[PDB]
Design a protein around this ligand. Structure first.
Ligand SMILES: CCCCCCCCCCCCCCCCCC(=O)OC[C@H](COP(=O)([O-])OCC(O)COP(=O)([O-])OC[C@@H](COC(=O)CCCCCCCCCCCCCCCCC)OC(=O)CCCCCCCCCCCCCCCCC)OC(=O)CCCCCCCCCCCCCCCCC
Ligand SMILES: COC1=C(OC)C(=O)C(C/C=C(\C)CC/C=C(\C)CC/C=C(\C)CC/C=C(/C)CC/C=C(\C)CC/C=C(\C)CC/C=C(\C)CC/C=C(/C)CCC=C(C)C)=C(C)C1=O
Ligand SMILES: CCCCCCCCCCCCCCCCCC(=O)OC[C@H](COP(=O)([O-])OCC[N+](C)(C)C)OC(=O)CCCCCCCCCCCCCCCCC
Ligand SMILES: CCCCCCCCCCCCCCCCCC(=O)OC[C@H](COP(=O)([O-])OCC[N+](C)(C)C)OC(=O)CCCCCCCCCCCCCCCCC
Ligand SMILES: CCCCCCCCCCCCCCCCCC(=O)OC[C@H](COP(=O)(O)OCCN)OC(=O)CCCCCCCCCCCCCCCCC
Ligand SMILES: CCCCCCCCCCCCCCCCCC(=O)OC[C@H](COP(=O)(O)OCCN)OC(=O)CCCCCCCCCCCCCCCCC
Ligand SMILES: CCCCCCCCCCCCCCCCCC(=O)OC[C@H](COP(=O)(O)OCCN)OC(=O)CCCCCCCCCCCCCCCCC
Ligand SMILES: COC1=C(OC)C(=O)C(CC=C(C)C)=C(C)C1=O
Ligand code: SF4
Ligand code: SF4
Lengths: 157, 386, 314, 174, 92, 28, 96, 80, 67
């Protein structure tokens, strides 16, 4: 076919497939939910298998997984690093301590959620959110990206 | 300020929250002033507003690599204040999962140490073994980590019917897995260099800065709170403390690999000699009544209702009880009024003392040396920040 | 034709360059008890193309930095690495140069700048510290790297890489000169900043710190192409593939096999060893290797003369 | 009982042995052999969507409110599940239903606040609130994670068959 | 020329990639050791340059003088190195 | 497992001990 | 030895119906293996268990297209498996 | 002195080998049955045309066909 | 098992032999069926160009005893 709209969709898809197949994460590793992510990186549940690299610096990172309490002192940093990533960037909040406030919600030093400091795309629930659950959450980010249609909106704009 | 740089909190090195300001004349470190509190969360103040049983989950989060061993310290502390002691089977359990937890911590400390050094294959090799252990936790507690299994009066629920057998198959083999790591790092012509003679700590200085852990044991001081002041039934087992000489990053490492080995000796015994019995004190006053009992007996419902809604009501007093958590001496100073909710609960973290030593250890050292020393202290910022 | 012969010798290498990352993310995987990337495409074959597209699409953020010593640096890195494949003598080379090995030594030397330029361009402390150390070991290793070749040449008779195919018609130059092969292999590991000798851009995030998207990719591509090229130079200079003038491809077939195995070896080295300290690294070259190389250099000016084996020029 | 982890003549045989170790990197080659060995071992990873990591009956996972087989919801609003929740997650307000029975008008578990301790599972006398097996409930928006009575009751109806099997397996232990 | 053709394709391929990249997504000198190393490097480089003619010089009729010369050069530089290893040099 | 008796021997020779006895694949 | 290894690979490829059938399994899972079919649930799903494989991979479910009309052939989701068969897949209960 | 060489061969086993080679290369040339050949074998290799001299007379130079038995020979090179 | 690292390698190998076979047949086809002569020293060029001047306008064309 040639009517551009079709052509555009196909192109977008390719773009989405590339970003969704290779997501390079970065793990601030606040707290413990970091241990449950290292497990994902580990052999039972290989993250790489999916195209997620075990480690990445902020410049080269597609997704930031905030694992653990985002305390008030670390809150300015989180932002900095979120602000130091590329134009196509995403945030997967991991842990009840970062989805909301968790066991430490009413504390004076804990931000009640990272979505008060960084926009969050997928919220993975559980105190130590199971590694399979993170993997489920990373896979749902992949379905979120697949649906994104950036060029078709350009074309229809 | 010698081009002072701040070690990154996000940095892959570190446990995620270490802003180590370091003034460095080129590649030499002149002074390290670690900053802390990037993970302060209020754990000590929050506990004052919670009942004894609802503050147990906080202890698992204080240093969560060592999930349970930490609980045992609060357990012991609350049991002392009540002058109640757990039933015989529960004691062995706590030593069984106490040790399994030590392995879990050492697999974390040795393999994460290497990842910062640059060796990445040991981590994947042993994280698979870790994984298998987590499954023990899950099939005993319900949670992979953050179990809440060791409660103030014993364990929560007896082991599933079949766990012991599997904690055997694993133990029967884990050794080879430690052996492998060895063939990759103990004698690597290169591990030794980056680790040997780095962060040597004298014996007198280690006691002075309150190191109290492998860090002391590595310098040759013989102190294992598990042999000196036995807690639970760690007295009935027989193990050898792995003391070290020429204390340095390499020697202490060897010590941590040796306690992984000695813990398999303690686990074996616990499987060989765990008694038939109950896993929680029979005082409905301290331990919650069995669900069949609370659903058929009035005194049990009343005791279930009051225990869950109000609490233990510990007698007024204060105690400092210290165990030998994998990192080092983990102690809870729990001051308590007669109320069901504690008054103070300073958690002594093996780690607040160790970090402080970073300055006196990493002197005239290169940027890479600092990375090696943070590893040889097994710093989990949860315990330090509390 | 010559143009076609430029596509071949380039594309083919670029496509192979992409498949090395994949065979790195799988060989490291199984060594670490994990499948590696197999879900995108069949057995992960489409995996290298996928992140290439993700990398180019993501924003090439220009830091609040030079704008040339920033864009010249990846262009130079890819240009020199792909360029050094021009004179390589697989069967018969594309551009046969009488002083070929000096071309390879000189072109490699120029890549140290890209590291220096990228580090200055970033204008952040992590980048400058990393670049200065990185430049130091690269040129430090160049000094033994060059002397090791001079020992070889004196037993080959010329600087042209094509001569070694005639020098190694009876035996690999590993048998003789094995002591230097090892020292060429370790130096090849340093100059490609691979693991045992990969202090720059370590878990400490040097000259990629500020580099993301397209610039990241170009060096990136460069490193991996180099990873191959240097391994290929080991597979011509020391492991001489059998050459039959009647059928030229068994030379390239064995060149293919030896290059892949030695390329596999630095992948295997990476997973197997912790990274050396910055001074540990220079301690090796200036203390452990340079005295060995300079002395064995003299032995290779003496072996020819008193064994009446002075090599035939040409 | 203590042990010395690292507590410690020069003969040609010995030295020549030691010099060869430094010169030809003998121990380094030993390390390479170990990794080559595993390369040949079967990888331990699982196809995550197709094959799932095993979780036994006590796995806490995601909260659900059960109902009696007849169809009357089990909760009778004693509200001690609220009392023992460590995170203050469960909010319960109740009023006598017209039937005259006691039921919860609003039961809200804030899952982002919840730290999945499993005490609520423990505390309930009628065992109305249970830790359900599902762990995959990741949500695009924060509001979805907050759960009211209707989501939990719906969660309870969906997973009741497995929840009943899980409680069946572990109740003797409790 | 033949080489030029190849090289300009080489630059073109790289310039094409950087462009695509940009167009598609629409102070302490403490280590004088550092400097020291680098001084050594050229002294060694320059030395290499003196050794670089040795392949042509092998065929020199003299031979005796060749080796006598080459051995002296390698030995005197190595002694330079030696003295780098006697004081606090090359010990960064 | 499924060593085939030759990959296993390369495995045993390279490792220097018997992995067959202590395998990474847990079985019934 | 390896020839029997090769015959096992051939049977796995022939096992998934025709060339097109294995291509379908190949693309969505990236793993080809043959197992007895324990059950097919009413939402389109097929479950297979092999005793020989290690504990992590001996039970697998091959998801089906449009199990609630969602075009699920490519966007496979963990939640698609029904609650009854969830515990069998996670090894919570041995019984199918 | 034995120790100066037995520990220096156990530890520091590079400089020992390094020096040893330095010397062995400084000796073999002096003592060898072939060293002389190098200056000959390379001398003989004919690169520049050999210009012929006028035959004034009474000369041992190979006249006519170079194959004449007179003159220099490289049978030493042959069967070397 | 490890069976799978081979796919990727195959595509590397195949992409490292092409170049060596390609350069060595685009020479034997752009030089009249004969290896491309290697002019390393002035004399090899001379004979190479002398030959050009000998016949046709290309060196591969080689006039024989029958000329
Ligand atoms: C190179 C030529 C092939 C070499 C080779 O296949 O070696 C594997 C072969 C068996 O490996 P293994 O680790 O024993 O396999 C585990 C079981 O024994 C056997 O494993 P199994 O029980 O799973 O056996 C069934 C298996 C059997 O698979 C096969 O044997 C057929 C493979 C056909 C490849 C074309 O089929 C599968 O599992 C599905 C995968 C089929 C092949 C996938 C990879 C294709 C790569 C294509 C490019 C190469 O190893 C050798 O016999 C020596 C090969 C040389 C080593 C150096
Ligand atoms: C922090 O940044 C990062 C690194 O630095 C430490 C990495 O190296 C790594 C690890 C490196 C890897 C092997 C994975 C990434 C791999 C790539 C970028 C491969 C890129 C592929 C290509 C450009 C293929 C080139 C193709 C062509 C142009 C063919 C043309 C004909 C990652 C993932 C990273 O995030
Ligand atoms: C082909 C062109 C070769 C030109 C060589 C010029 C040599 C003299 C120096 C010229 C550059 C310095 C100058 O005066 O201009 C400042 C300018 C400064 O450019 P700039 O923008 O990179 O530097 C400042 C960056 N800011 C301000 C953002 C921090 O130089 C240039 O514009 C780039 C010069 C490139 C020189 C040619 C490189 C060719 C490849 C080399 C390998
Ligand atoms: C050039 C390098 C390769 C470019 C992309 C080639 C095709 C990629 C592709 O088809 O992705 C698979 C996907 C299908 O896979 P998927 O990503 O939708 O689903 C994967 C499901 N798992 C992960 C479980 C295996 O195809 C697409 O949906 C996008 C195709 C776009 C084609 C546009 C024209 C070309
Ligand atoms: C980017 C910059 C680095 C690029 C990669 C490194 C290039 C290194 C070139 C070395 C010099 C060329 C050479 O050594 O041989 C060229 C060859 C002459 O040698 P030879 O074949 O032995 O001649 C007699 C017997 N045939 O035959 C020739 O003389 C061909 C003509 C000379 C070609 C030299 C290379 C030309 C490069 C053109 C692009 C340069 C871009 C420079 C960019 C920086 C700013 C100037
Ligand atoms: C008549 C005879 C005349 C000739 C006489 C010859 C005498 C016998 C030969 C003598 C020299 C033999 C060895 C030469 C190479 C080794 C030189 C050396 O000493 O290595 C340096 C270093 C030493 O280790 P270290 O403990 O740091 O130093 C101790 C002393 N300070 O070692 C290292 O740190 C190595 C670090 C390596 C990191 C990567 C390891 C990769 C291993 C696998 C690849 C091995 C090479 C493969 C080559 C394939 C073919 C090219
Ligand atoms: C080309 C020529 C060879 C290479 C020359 C260039 C490098 C020269 C280096 C000389 C270094 C002298 C020195 O001070 O090194 C002492 C050595 C290492 O000590 P240090 O650097 O402090 O390191 C300690 C931590 N590893 O610690 C030692 O004691 C090493 C002792 C090495 C010598 C032992 C004997 C070796 C055999 C000597 C044979 C004859 C030597 C030549 C004789 C010439 C005259 C005939
Ligand atoms: C526990 O502390 C932590 C680290 O050091 C030990 C990490 O390296 C990392 C980084 C690890 C990964 C998964 C990239 C994390 C997440 C962390 O929190
Ligand atoms: S959520 Fe549970 S696990 Fe994740 S950080 Fe907060 S407490 Fe630790
Ligand atoms: S405890 Fe069980 S019953 Fe009582 S309120 Fe909480 S949920 Fe409803």
């Amino acid at each position: 076919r040639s009517r551009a709209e079709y052509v555009v969709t196909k192109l977008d898809d390719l773009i989405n497939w590339a970003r969704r197949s290779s997501l390079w994460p970065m793990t601030f590793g606040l707290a413990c939910c970091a241990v449950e992510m290292m497990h994902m990186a580990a052999p039972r549940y290989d993250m790489d298998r999916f195209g997620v690299v075990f480690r990445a610096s902020p410049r080269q990172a597609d997704v930031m997984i905030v694992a653990g309490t985002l305390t008030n002192k670390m809150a300015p940093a989180l932002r900095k690093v979120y602000d130091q990533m590329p134009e196509p960037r995403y945030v997967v909040s991991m842990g009840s301590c970062a989805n909301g406030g968790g066991y430490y919600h009413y504390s004076y030093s804990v931000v009640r959620g990272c979505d008060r400091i960084v926009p969050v795309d997928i919220y993975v629930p559980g105190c130590p959110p199971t590694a399979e659950a993170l993997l489920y959450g990373i896979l749902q980010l992949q379905r979120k990206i697949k649906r994104e249609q950036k060029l078709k909106i350009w074309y229809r704009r | 300020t010698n081009m002072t740089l701040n070690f990154g909190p996000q940095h892959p090195a570190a446990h995620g929250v270490l802003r180590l300001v370091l003034e460095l004349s080129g590649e030499m470190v002149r002074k390290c002033d670690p900053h802390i509190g990037l993970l302060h969360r209020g754990t000590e103040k929050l506990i004052e507003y919670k009942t004894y049983l609802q503050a147990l989950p906080y202890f698992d989060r204080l240093d969560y690599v060592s999930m349970m061993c930490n609980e045992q310290a609060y357990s012991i502390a609350v049991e002392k204040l009540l002058n109640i002691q757990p039933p015989p089977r529960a004691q062995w359990i706590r030593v069984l999962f106490g040790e399994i937890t030590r392995i879990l911590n050492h697999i974390m400390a040795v393999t994460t140490h290497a990842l910062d050094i640059g060796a990445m294959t040991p981590f994947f090799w042993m994280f698979e073994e870790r994984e298998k252990m987590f499954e023990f936790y899950e099939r005993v507690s319900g949670a992979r980590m953050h179990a809440a299994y060791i409660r103030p009066g014993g364990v929560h629920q007896d082991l599933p019917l079949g766990l012991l057998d599997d904690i055997y198959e694993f133990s029967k083999n884990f050794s080879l897995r430690i052996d492998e790591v060895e063939e990759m790092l103990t004698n690597n012509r290169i591990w030794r260099n980056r680790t040997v003679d780095i962060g040597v700590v004298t014996a007198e200085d280690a006691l002075n800065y309150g190191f109290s852990g492998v860090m002391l044991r590595g310098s040759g001081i013989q102190w294992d709170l598990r042999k000196t002041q036995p807690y639970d039934v760690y007295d009935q087992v027989e193990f050898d403390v792995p003391i070290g000489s020429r204390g340095d990053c390499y020697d202490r490492y060897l010590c941590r690999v040796e306690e992984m080995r000695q813990s398999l000796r303690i686990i074996e015994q616990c499987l060989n000699k765990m008694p038939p019995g109950e896993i929680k004190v029979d005082d409905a006053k301290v331990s919650p009544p069995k669900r069949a009992e609370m659903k058929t007996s009035m005194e049990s419902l009343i005791h279930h209702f009051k225990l869950y809604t109000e609490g233990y009501q510990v007698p007024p007093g204060a105690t400092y009880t210290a165990i030998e958590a994998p990192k080092g001496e983990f102690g809870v100073y729990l001051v308590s009024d007669g109320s069901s909710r504690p008054y103070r609960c300073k958690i002594k973290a093996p780690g607040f003392a160790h970090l402080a030593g970073l300055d006196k250890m990493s002197k005239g050292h290169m940027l890479a040396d600092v990375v090696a020393i943070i590893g040889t202290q097994d710093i989990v910022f949860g315990e330090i920040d509390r | 034709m010559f143009f076609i012969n430029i596509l071949t010798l380039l594309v083919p290498i670029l496509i192979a360059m992409a498949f090395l990352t994949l065979v790195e993310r799988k060989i490291l995987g199984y060594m670490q008890l994990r499948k590696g990337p197999n879900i995108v495409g069949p057995y992960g074959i489409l995996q290298p193309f996928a992140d290439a597209m993700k990398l180019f699409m993501k924003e090439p953020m220009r830091p609040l930095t030079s704008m040339s010593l920033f864009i010249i640096a990846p262009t130079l890195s890819l240009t020199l690495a792909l360029s050094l494949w021009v004179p390589l003598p697989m069967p018969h080379p594309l551009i046969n140069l009488n002083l070929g090995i000096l071309f390879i030594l000189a072109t490699s030397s120029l890549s140290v700048y890209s590291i220096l330029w990228s580090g200055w361009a970033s204008n952040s402390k992590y980048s400058l510290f990393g670049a200065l150390r990185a430049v130091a070991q690269t040129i430090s290793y160049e000094v033994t790297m060059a002397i090791i070749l001079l020992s070889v040449l004196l037993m080959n008779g010329s600087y042209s890489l094509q001569t070694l195919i005639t020098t190694q018609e009876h035996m690999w130059l590993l048998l003789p000169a094995w002591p230097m092969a090892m020292m060429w292999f370790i130096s090849t590991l340093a100059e490609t900043n691979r693991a045992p000798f990969d202090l720059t851009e370590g878990e400490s995030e040097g000259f990629n710190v500020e580099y993301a998207a397209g610039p990241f990719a170009l060096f990136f591509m460069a490193e991996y192409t180099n990873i191959i090229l240097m391994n290929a130079l080991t597979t011509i200079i020391f492991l001489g593939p059998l050459y039959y003038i009647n059928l030229p491809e068994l030379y390239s077939t064995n060149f293919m096999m030896e290059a892949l195995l030695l390329s596999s070896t630095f992948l295997w080295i990476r997973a197997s060893y912790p990274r050396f300290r910055y001074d540990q690294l220079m301690h090796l070259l200036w203390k452990n290797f340079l005295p060995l190389t300079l002395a064995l250099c003299m032995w290779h000016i003496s072996l020819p003369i008193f064994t009446a084996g002075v090599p035939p020029y040409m | 009982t203590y042990k010395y982890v690292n507590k410690k003549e020069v003969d040609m045989k010995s030295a020549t042995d030691n010099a060869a170790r430094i010169l030809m990197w003998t121990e380094l080659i030993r390390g390479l052999g170990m990794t080559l060995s595993y390369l040949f071992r079967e990888p331990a990873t699982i196809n995550y969507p197709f094959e799932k990591g095993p979780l036994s009956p006590r796995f806490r996972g995601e909260h659900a409110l059960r109902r009696y087989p007849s169809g009357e919801e089990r909760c009778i609003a004693c509200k001690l599940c609220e009392a023992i929740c460590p995170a203050q997650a469960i909010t319960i307000e109740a009023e006598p239903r017209a039937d005259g029975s006691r039921r919860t008008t609003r039961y809200d578990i804030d899952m982002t606040k919840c730290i999945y301790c499993g005490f609520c599972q423990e505390a309930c006398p009628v065992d109305a609130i249970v830790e359900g097996p599902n762990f995959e409930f990741s949500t695009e928006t924060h509001e979805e994670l907050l759960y009211n009575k209707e989501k939990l009751l719906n969660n309870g109806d969906k997973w009741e068959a497995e929840i009943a099997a899980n409680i069946q397996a572990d109740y003797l232990y409790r | 020329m033949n080489l030029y053709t190849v090289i300009f394709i080489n630059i073109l391929l790289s310039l094409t990639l950087i462009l695509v990249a940009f167009w598609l997504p629409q102070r302490l000198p403490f280590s004088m050791k550092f400097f020291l190393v680098a001084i050594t490097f050229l002294l060694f480089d320059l030395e290499i340059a003196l050794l670089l003619p040795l392949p042509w010089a092998i065929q020199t009729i003299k031979t005796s003088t060749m080796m006598i010369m080459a051995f002296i050069l390698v030995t005197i530089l190595s002694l330079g190195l030696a003295y780098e290893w006697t004081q606090k040099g090359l010990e960064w | 497992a499924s060593a085939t008796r030759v990959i296993q021997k390369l495995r045993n020779w390279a490792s220097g001990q018997d992995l067959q006895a202590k395998l990474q694949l847990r079985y019934q | 030895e390896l020839v029997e290894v090769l015959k096992r690979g051939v049977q796995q490829v022939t096992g998934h119906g025709g060339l097109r059938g294995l291509l379908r399994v190949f693309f969505r899972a990236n793993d080809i293996r043959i197992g007895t079919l324990v059950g097919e649930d009413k939402y389109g799903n097929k479950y297979y268990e092999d005793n020989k494989q290690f504990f992590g991979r001996h039970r697998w479910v091959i998801y089906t297209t449009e199990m609630n009309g969602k075009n699920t052939f490519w966007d496979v989701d963990g939640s698609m498996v029904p609650p009854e068969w969830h515990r069998w897949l996670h090894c919570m209960t041995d019984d199918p | 002195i034995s120790a100066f060489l037995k520990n220096a061969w156990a530890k520091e086993p590079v400089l020992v080998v390094s020096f040893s080679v330095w010397g062995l290369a400084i000796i073999m040339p002096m003592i060898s049955p072939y060293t002389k050949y190098a200056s000959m074998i390379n001398k003989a290799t004919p690169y520049n045309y050999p210009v012929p001299v006028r035959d004034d007379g009474n000369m041992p130079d190979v006249p006519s066909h170079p194959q004449d038995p007179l003159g220099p020979s490289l049978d030493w090179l042959k069967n070397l | 098992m490890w069976f799978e690292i081979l796919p990727g390698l195959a595509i590397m190998g195949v992409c490292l032999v092409i170049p060596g076979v390609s350069t060595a047949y685009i020479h034997k086809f752009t030089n009249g069926g004969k290896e491309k002569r290697v002019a390393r020293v002035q004399y090899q060029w001379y004979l190479m160009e002398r030959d050009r001047r000998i016949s046709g306008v290309n060196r591969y064309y080689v006039s024989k005893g029958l000329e």
